Design a protein around this ligand. Sequence first.
Ligand SMILES: O=C(O)/C=C/c1ccc(O)cc1
Length: 322
Amino acid sequence: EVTLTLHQFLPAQANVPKDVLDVWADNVEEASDGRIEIERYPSMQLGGTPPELMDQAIDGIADIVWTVVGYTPGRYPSTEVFELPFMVSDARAASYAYWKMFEEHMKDGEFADVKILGTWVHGPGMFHTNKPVAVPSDLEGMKIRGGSRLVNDLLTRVGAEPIGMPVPAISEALSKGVIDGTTIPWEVTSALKVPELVGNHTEFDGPALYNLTFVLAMNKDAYESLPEDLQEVIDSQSGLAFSIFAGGTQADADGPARQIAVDRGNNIVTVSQEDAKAWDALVNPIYETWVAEMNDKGIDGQALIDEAKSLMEEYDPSMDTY
Ligand SMILES: O=C(O)/C=C/c1ccc(O)cc1
């Protein structure tokens, strides 16, 4: 008999809590043969702001968290390789690449302090806005919410005023008019009532404008101090295949959410790959400043970008078992 607490920042019925974390938690419960019990706390019920979740898991406030790596900005700089503009065409391939790279580069450097169970990205990042956005010029003077320093850099370069705030705060911020719009993929839009609060959406054909990285993290001491066969049980239900499943389940949930916006009669602008090039011209210098930043930290930035593209093409869709 062991009770582990999982703390996370969205409601219990949202896509990732329901179809990724519960699934994962039940799999741990089963493979343990009812010897591990995992209690699930949503919407920061045990207290804190979403950015403190990692520290909650490192310090032992909670055993397990699902958080957004970028809410601790520049803390895990190697994850940023997947957050560069127009990097990612498939979330599964990204998550494959992310887990593989986590093991080689990150596990014992930047994530030494914590146990990582899962490394993934969401579906295509996009805009949701009070007024229409069909070309970059339309974002000039708009206050746009972003969730990470690289998204904020992206917003600056296309001419928006970036407002850093965690995702649950979006509804209140739109309602009060603190922001004119937000970045987020489709899937989380319905839990935040975004399609109710704004009437315009801007999506991209081709590689994603951006996506953000996530982890399922666990307290190290709480892991190590399990017995050897229960450690084996946690690891077995986590890691590479789990990371591929979370990314894919999260991206696949874009579809039903986009259709809820369509059903309302909201205006959705789809930017062709050809028309995306104007956006790329504005955002693509992030590649050079990011590599300069990494080099300033003694990190081979270009090697991470090359490696990440290498691994993603390499992804076969039958490394996807979970
Ligand atoms: O942009 C952010 O601040 C967070 C993004 C996010 C997107 C989908 C989720 O299910 C949770 C967080």
